[PDB]
Amino acid sequence: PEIVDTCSLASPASVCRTKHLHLRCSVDFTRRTLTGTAALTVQSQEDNLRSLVLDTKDLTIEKVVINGQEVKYALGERQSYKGSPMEISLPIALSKNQEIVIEISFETSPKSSALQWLTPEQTSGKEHPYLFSQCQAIHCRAILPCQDTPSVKLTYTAEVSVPKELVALMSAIRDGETPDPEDPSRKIYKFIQKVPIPCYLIALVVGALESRQIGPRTLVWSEKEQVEKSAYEFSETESMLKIAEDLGGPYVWGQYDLLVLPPSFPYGGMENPCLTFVTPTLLAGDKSLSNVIAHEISHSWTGNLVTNKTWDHFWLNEGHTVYLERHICGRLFGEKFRHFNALGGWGELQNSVKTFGETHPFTKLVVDLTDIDPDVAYSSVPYEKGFALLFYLEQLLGGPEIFLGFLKAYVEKFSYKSITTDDWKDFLYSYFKDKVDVLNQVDWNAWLYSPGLPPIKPNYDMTLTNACIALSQRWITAKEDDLNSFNATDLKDLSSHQLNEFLAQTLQRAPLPLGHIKRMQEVYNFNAINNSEIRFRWLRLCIQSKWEDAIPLALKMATEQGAMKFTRPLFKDLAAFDKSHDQAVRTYQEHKASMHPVTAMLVGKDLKVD
Ligand SMILES: [Yb+3]
Ligand SMILES: [Zn+2]
């Protein structure tokens, strides 16, 4: 059984394995570079190993030392998004299982696709710079030399020098701080991660950070002005943790802190161990976006403990996580809610499939990322098609309680490992051997390898969805002489989630007559809502329905925060509407330079600029 990681140019795990990383670096804000030494403890998996290759992307190598001596290495020619392979000639040949530590002195590019440097004006306090990282999927190679594949798991310790007045944090347990002996104007923050992790989980943030405790094992971190709001917004964290432990077994990471990043953080959240990163667009004031926390918490099991061997199997990470996420929210709020959210997810899947096209490669559950930048292929398919499969297996195998038993054993079975879709499928058949006849009734080839919507839609309770659909239908079928019937009381019995679903149902038939949209603002005043998911969908409906007054609102939301899930569709909508097209392109060109590297590149391709 042999599978290779097409996204990595490093020696695969079958040749050698990194067991530990000891990172000693200093954050240079004046140069926008991270400088230091990455000491890798590498174990040979072969006989007579004399050299190995590591992944790198836009790194500057000062030197490589093994056994106290500088050794030969050579950087191959760059291979676009994959970066440049770095071959290192080992001084002595290694036997199988033999280990050695290679210390690489390096410097990052201010252009690193893993990093975003922010001037003081880009932060909340306006007096200090800020730095944050984002390694998933394959950007760790852009911070330090390494076997940048999730098929290798290692532990790590790190010491980071940073201006005295700032604070550093990493995906690890804080192990102290002290003044920097070699430069009084700095502080050195120490960290240790004892649980083996794929390198894409390595994370670093440096900024004027403050914290506040919100649970027995949770501190919320952010700049001063976001602390209070965040502490309230994420107050359900410990209870969600307890439910997750009940579903997946013990939380093995020690602490579970939350870091609330500046508005340009590219994702809703990132499951960095010990320190989940979240977008500040979750600060709705009513905890209505807490499913994102339940999602990240879930990853502490599905993704961080059981990890996908290569990015071709990312759905293993996301599908199981969404599945656990919905059980946490179902426990907290009722099975009817889980079905509602499960049903909404199906709607997002239809959207993704319609967007890519139903035969498009990226709509396959298991994809072939050979020569495909993971950032370009990222979408809701692995999340929702993956979730759909498990929900479908759940109803096929006997209900939530039975499938949850398989989920826990699955986590137990593959803890601290990296697996493929086949490993998952073999264990499913093994666990449910006494139901193989049932298992043999699913169209595996279609589910796992065919593009488009799944060959079968699961069954969903519709109780909380009905009112949404009914209101959506009233608006869609309404003619001009029916617009007067609409009133603020139409929303009286709807929760913020039903409101969001109401918009999603309506967005799927966009555009609607411009007069219908104006009326909607008139009676429901959606312009006044700051819930980001709701506002996002409202502005898309407005732009797609060609209401020019929405342009400034859409452009504003698109640039004042950078969560790609909101920013990319907004710029795209703005660019497809002839009246805002030039302004969309122009706004992008002017913001590009101070945008997150990955977000800039992707919006750039969506707008077809440069
Ligand atoms: Yb030998
Ligand atoms: Zn996830």
Curated annotation (Swiss-Prot):
Quaternary structure note: Monomer.
Biological processes, Gene Ontology terms: leukotriene biosynthetic process; lipid metabolic process; peptide catabolic process; protein metabolic process; proteolysis; response to peptide hormone; response to zinc ion; type I pneumocyte differentiation
Cofactor: Zn(2+)
Impact upon substituting residue 384 to Q: Reduced aminopeptidase activity. Minor effect on epoxide hydrolase activity
Phosphoserine: residues carrying this PTM: 415
One cellular component term from this protein's GO annotations in UniProt: nucleoplasm
Gene (name only): LTA4H
Protein location: Cytoplasm
Effect of residue 318 to A: Complete loss of LTA4 hydrolase and peptidase enzyme activities
PTM field: Phosphorylation at Ser-415 inhibits leukotriene-A4 hydrolase activity.
Residues that hold Zn(2+) according to the record: 295, 299, 318
Claim: Protease is one of the keywords in the record: yes
Result, substituting residue 375 to A: Strongly reduced hydrolysis of peptides starting with Arg. Small effect on hydrolysis of peptides starting with Ala. Abolishes epoxide hydrolase activity
Species assigned in the record: Homo sapiens (Human)
Activity: how regulated: Inhibited by bestatin. The epoxide hydrolase activity is restrained by suicide inactivation that involves binding of LTA4 to Tyr-378. 4-(4-benzylphenyl)thiazol-2-amine (ARM1) selectively inhibits the epoxide hydrolase activity.
Name this protein carries in UniProt: Leukotriene A-4 hydrolase
Listed pathway(s): Lipid metabolism; leukotriene B4 biosynthesis
Phenotypic consequence of residue 136 to A: No loss of activity
Annotated function: Bifunctional zinc metalloenzyme that comprises both epoxide hydrolase (EH) and aminopeptidase activities. Acts as an epoxide hydrolase to catalyze the conversion of LTA4 to the pro-inflammatory mediator leukotriene B4 (LTB4). Also has aminopeptidase activity, with high affinity for N-terminal arginines of various synthetic tripeptides.
PROSITE patterns referenced in this protein's UniProt entry, alphabetically: ZINC_PROTEASE (PS00142)
Effect of residue 565 to R: No effect on epoxide hydrolase and aminopeptidase activity
Result of changing residue 565 to A/M: Strongly reduced affinity for peptide substrates. Reduced epoxide hydrolase and aminopeptidase activity
Organs and tissues of expression: Isoform 1 and isoform 2 are expressed in monocytes, lymphocytes, neutrophils, reticulocytes, platelets and fibroblasts.
Pfam families: Leuk-A4-hydro_C, Peptidase_M1, Peptidase_M1_N
Positions of the record's site feature: Covalently modified during suicide inhibition by leukotrienes: 378
Catalytic activity: leukotriene A4 + H2O = leukotriene B4; (5S,6S)-epoxy-(18R)-hydroxy-(7E,9E,11Z,14Z,16E)-eicosapentaenoate + H2O = resolvin E1; (5S,6S)-epoxy-(18S)-hydroxy-(7E,9E,11Z,14Z,16E)-eicosapentaenoate + H2O = 18S-resolvin E1; Release of the N-terminal residue from a tripeptide
Effect of substituting residue 296 to A: Loss of epoxide hydrolase and aminopeptidase activities
